Amino acid sequence: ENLMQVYQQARLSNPELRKSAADRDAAFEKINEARSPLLPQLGLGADYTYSNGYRDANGINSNATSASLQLTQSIFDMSKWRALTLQEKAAGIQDVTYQTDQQTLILNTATAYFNVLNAIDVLSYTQAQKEAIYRQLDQTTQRFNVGLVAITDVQNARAQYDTVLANELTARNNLDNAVEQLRQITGNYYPELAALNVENFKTDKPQPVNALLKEAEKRNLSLLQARLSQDLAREQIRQAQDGHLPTLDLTASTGISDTSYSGSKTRGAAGTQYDDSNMGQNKVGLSFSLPIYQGGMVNSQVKQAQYNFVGASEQLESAHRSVVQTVRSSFNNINASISSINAYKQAVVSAQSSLDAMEAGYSVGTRTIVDVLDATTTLYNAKQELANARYNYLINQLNIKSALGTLNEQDLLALNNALSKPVSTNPE
């Protein structure tokens, strides 16, 4: 029930990634659609007709029946090739989005895993605080019923106890919600999860900022998709100028049609003009066409494409600045986490001394049990904060590496050494 076992199932259960995979497959398969028009196309054309002339052509009756096939093959029209180029670039963009989604899945699973354990720690602290506050109430009540204290003190103690009970209920609810959050990502209810092995924690140091900047510029996902968009805009510009290009097609058709002639006027002195015929047709030919003026429409589409391209370039520059600032922020965040870890470590070192000193006084008889319980609660506070700091450090390490774009699953030794014995998630 460590992070690796939870993420392996999350990979094959998460619908957010599955939708991304479906989108990528739709984008890829669509290319075959755009290559279809270039190939030849066949069709059938049977039909029927009936006519009845009037006005001058009075008393003329006729009926017709025909059926034929068609086949058109485009010889030279680059309009269809530019569609293929644009569609392959679209496929590239979709694949980049898929990579981004994969990294997101990893990060979200890790975050939920740590949130559960944080909830458990705060719950333990709240239980200790409740016990201390209850002992205080018992002491005050006994004093009052023997004297030495007014009723207002009793009511104040009751208020504090009710407040700690409310906090305990809130903590239980939060522990359930986080588990429910862990079931919403992975898709399974986990009763037991491993925790941090405190005795083997690593406060590593990060690389210089400039090296991270270079790696980011080289292999970041956002700016890569932005570059794909810029290339797509250039290709669209190339597609705009395709209008002036002439086009030609090669079409061939064949079919039969047997038409007979009748009528009182037709019969008699026909002269061979109205005799029936049973010829066929095997037409084959070409076709060529080219626009001359077109009122400058294409000369306007060309400028629209150029403006779109410059807009895309500005977008790319914005994305570049964004990635730079993000990498700097992540580096600073890691350093801040290191410093906070040191501070909390010293803080817990100090609180241990006081809880140790309160215990000895009770052993000899200078203090009371209430002091010991209060010191225990404070130390539990020093314990819950330190664990939170450690988890934040780990998540920030993952965050910087994700900004580099270089993490999919190489966080195998990163967390394997950070695991320990199972800890229950919903004790009863």
CB of 190 to a second copy, least distance (A): 15
Amino acid at 61: N
Nearer to a second copy, 80 or 238 (CB): 80
CB of 428 to a second copy, least distance (A): 16
Nearer to a second copy, 108 or 301 (CB): 301
Identify the three-state secondary structure at position 193: strand
176 phi/psi in degrees, rounded to 5:
-65, -45
CB of 22 to a second copy, least distance (A): 4
CB of 398 to a second copy, least distance (A): 19
**Nearest of 51, 75, 77 to residue 64 by alpha carbon:** 51
Give CA–CA dist 207/364, Å, rounded: 53
Helices (H), 147-220: 151-185, 209-219
CB of 417 to a second copy, least distance (A): 26
- Tokens coding 226: 């932005």
Nearer to a second copy, 41 or 420 (CB): 41
Nearer to a second copy, 5 or 254 (CB): 254
The dihedral built from the CA positions of residue 107, 111, 114 and 116, taken in this order, carries a sign that is negative
**Nearest of 101, 99, 313, 318 to residue 227 by alpha carbon:** 313
CB of 1 to a second copy, least distance (A): 20
246: left (phi over 0), alpha (psi -120 to 50) or beta: beta
Nearer to a second copy, 53 or 263 (CB): 53
Nearer to a second copy, 132 or 319 (CB): 319
Nearer to a second copy, 71 or 419 (CB): 71
385: left (phi over 0), alpha (psi -120 to 50) or beta: alpha
CB of 157 to a second copy, least distance (A): 9
Residue labelled with tokens 């890790």: 110
